[PDB]
Design a protein around this nucleic acid. Sequence first.
DNA 1: ATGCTCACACT
DNA 2: AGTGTGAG
Length: 427
Amino acid sequence: MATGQDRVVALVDMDCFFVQVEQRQNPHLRNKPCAVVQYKSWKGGGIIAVSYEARAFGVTRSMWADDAKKLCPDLLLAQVRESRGKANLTKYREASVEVMEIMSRFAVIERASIDEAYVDLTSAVQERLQKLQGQPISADLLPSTYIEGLPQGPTVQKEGMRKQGLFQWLDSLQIDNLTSPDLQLTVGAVIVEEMRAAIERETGFQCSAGISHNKVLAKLACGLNKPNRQTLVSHGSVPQLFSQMPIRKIRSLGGKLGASVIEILGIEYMGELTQFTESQLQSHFGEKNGSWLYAMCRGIEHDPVKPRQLPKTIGCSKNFPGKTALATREQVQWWLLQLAQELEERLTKDRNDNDRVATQLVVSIRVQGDKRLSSLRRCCALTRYDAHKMSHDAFTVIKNCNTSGIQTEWSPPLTMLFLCATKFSAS
DNA sequence: ATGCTCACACT
DNA sequence: AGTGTGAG
Ligand SMILES: Nc1ccn([C@H]2C[C@H](O)[C@@H](COP(=O)(O)NP(=O)(O)OP(=O)(O)O)O2)c(=O)n1
Ligand SMILES: [Mn+2]
Ligand SMILES: [Mn+2]
C-alpha cells in the first residue's frame, strides 16, 4: 500500500498581500484596520484585500467600501492605481516577483497565484538530513510552527498550545530514521521557517505556509494558522483532520463538483468519503475525479509541483456592467486600444525580463443578456508588440458579433472585454 | 452592479 | 479551436 508520503511539499501564501504591499509603502496604514479597493466612486469602491485588524470587525472581500465603513468606521483604505481608465496591478505583480525570487533560491517553485507558490522540498530535505549528522531538532528551529492535531492527552493561550504540541512532536522524533516521513516533514518545516524569515527580512512582507506531503494538504495546512504562522500536517493527522473538515474546504471541491459530492453521496465531511470504493466514486463523478477523490480523502494526492515561476498568459480585461455597457462601435475601439496599450507595456517588460515572446492573442467578450463569465472567445496571431495592431486585430475578429445593422452602434451592448497574450516561445 | 485576473479540463 | 470550471 503506497501511502502518499513520498514528497515534502510546502505552500507559502502572503498574509493579506495587497494590504501589506500598501502598508510597506504607507507606514501609517501599518497595524491598523485597512482594506484595498478598486474604483472609488461607486459605493466607495469594492474591497479586494482586507487586513486582519479590519477582519476583526467583519470586513471582507467583495464588500463595498461604504458598507465596510459601516462595520468599521475607523477603517483606512488604499485604492489600486488607475491607468487608461482601468485598474493597474503593476505594484502587486512587482511585489510578487520579489517574493517569488527569494523562494526560488531554496527549491523549485510552482507559482500558484500572485501571492502564493508551492515548493517541493523533497531534495533539499534529504540534503539537510546529511548536513547535521544525526543530532536533534531543537524547538528553537520551529519558533512559529504548529503541529496539526497536537497537543493531545494529559496553558490556555495560543502560544502555549503551540509549544506543547511542538514539544510533544519533537519528543516523539525518530532522529535515527532518515527514512521516516514525519522526520522529513519536520526538516521541511525547518527550511520553511528560514524561507519565511528570508521573505520578511528581505521584503518586509509576512506570510504563512503549509508543510505536508502533497499540494492539497499543504494548501489546507497553510490556512489553519494564518497569519504569520506555518502548520505541519502529517499523514497521521489526516483522519482526525478530515473527520470534521467540510468537503468544500479542499482545493477544487469548492465549486459544483464538491456540491454534487455532497448531494449525491449525502455526506458533509472529507472523512466520510473513505466509506466508498474507488469504482463507486468513479461511477458518480468519472474516472479521474473518483480516483482523485478516493486517494484524497486518505491524504494521498499525486499532482506535482510544477517548475513554473512565470505565468503562462498575460491578460487584460475590464467589465462594463449596467448602463455602462459599450454600445457604440467607436466605444469598442477605444477600450480595445486601452487594453492593448497596457498589454503592450506588460509584454515588452516580459520579453526583456524573461527571454520569451507571446505568439497568439486571445480576445474574449461578454454581452448584456448572457450569464457566463465569458460569452465568446476568439483568437488571432500576435506578431508585433504594437497596441494599435493588437487592438485593430482584436476588433476584426469580434466585429461580426455586432447584431445591430446600424453602422455606428453596437448591440448587444458589451459588458466585458478581455485580451490575453499566450502561447509563449523562447526568444 | 463587485473588480481583474490566472490555470486547467473537456470536447 | 472554443467552452466551462475553479481559483486568488
Ligand atoms: N478574489 C480575489 C482574491 C484575491 N485577490 C488579490 C488580493 C489579495 O490580497 C491577493 C492574495 O489573495 P489571498 O491570499 O487569497 N488573500 P490575502 O493574501 O489578501 O489574505 P490571506 O487571507 O491570504 O491572509 O490576491 C483578488 O484580487 N481577488
Ligand atoms: Mn494571501
Ligand atoms: Mn493566496
